[PDB]
Design a protein around this ligand. Structure first.
Ligand code: BHU
Ligand code: ZN
Ligand code: ZN
Length: 231
């Protein structure tokens, strides 16, 4: 079974096999008086691993690297952060100290700096306008437009038809808006339309927080976002 928030002590990281060469990583962290679960992705990149997002903090990200070494045993050589919040970039300094080349869009890097968060080293090219996509090793990176944040990226693994939505996609059990401080609520439904348009064959859809599902999570997120807007 997919691990839930109450099953993971803060500081421990679980790995979950989604498909051949594709894992999610699951961690937990305290934020504003509560503890939340958080997902990222790991994709085999030949003899190396590509990491999508940190495990939300330095200590968690160190635990992530240790679990990867124990369970998978290939080196993480590159990481992509899919937006500027600490559940995506917190731990980039640990990754860099471990030899990982860290990447994000120029916008994510600037937004992280203003927020006082850690800053991925390298700028991704070609992701500036809504609908832009670039190949990055075994994945495609897609900028769907503003949603959960203005800079949020999604990631597709063609080999396995896995769509990693990050925090622009909600799990099915979430029925109220999450952290929308940095969101563009008016654009978010259209950005989800762009994801659906680009990845209609997705078989597994991974939200930034909580349980994976299928493309039903896209319509579900749109419903939650719109209802919050009508409040
Ligand atoms: C820090 C992280 C950025 S997306 C967050 O807001 N977690 C709480 B959530 O509602 O899951
Ligand atoms: Zn966020
Ligand atoms: Zn998040």
């Amino acid at each position: 079974e997919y691990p839930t928030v109450s099953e993971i002590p803060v500081g421990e990281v679980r790995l979950y096999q989604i498909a051949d060469g594709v894992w999610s990583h699951i961690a937990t962290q305290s934020f504003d008086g509560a503890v939340y679960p958080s997902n990222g992705l790991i994709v085999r990149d030949g003899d190396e691993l590509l990491l999508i997002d940190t495990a939300w903090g330095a200590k968690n990200t160190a635990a992530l690297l240790a679990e990867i070494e124990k369970q998978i045993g290939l080196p993480v050589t590159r990481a992509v952060s899919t937006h500027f919040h600490d559940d995506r970039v917190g731990g980039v300094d640990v990754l860099r100290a471990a030899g990982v080349a860290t990447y994000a869009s120029p916008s994510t890097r600037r937004l992280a700096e203003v927020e006082g968060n850690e800053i991925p080293t390298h700028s991704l090219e070609g992701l500036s306008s809504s609908g832009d996509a670039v190949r990055f090793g075994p994945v495609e990176l897609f900028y769907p437009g503003a949603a959960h944040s203005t800079d949020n990226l999604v990631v597709y693994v063609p080999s396995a038809s896995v769509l990693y939505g990050g925090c622009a996609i909600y799990e099915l059990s979430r029925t109220s808006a999450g952290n929308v401080a940095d969101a563009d609520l008016a654009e978010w439904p259209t950005s989800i339309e762009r994801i659906q348009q680009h990845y209609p064959e997705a078989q597994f859809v991974i939200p930034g927080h909580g349980l994976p599902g299928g493309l039903d999570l896209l319509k579900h997120t749109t419903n939650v976002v719109k209802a919050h807007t009508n409040r």
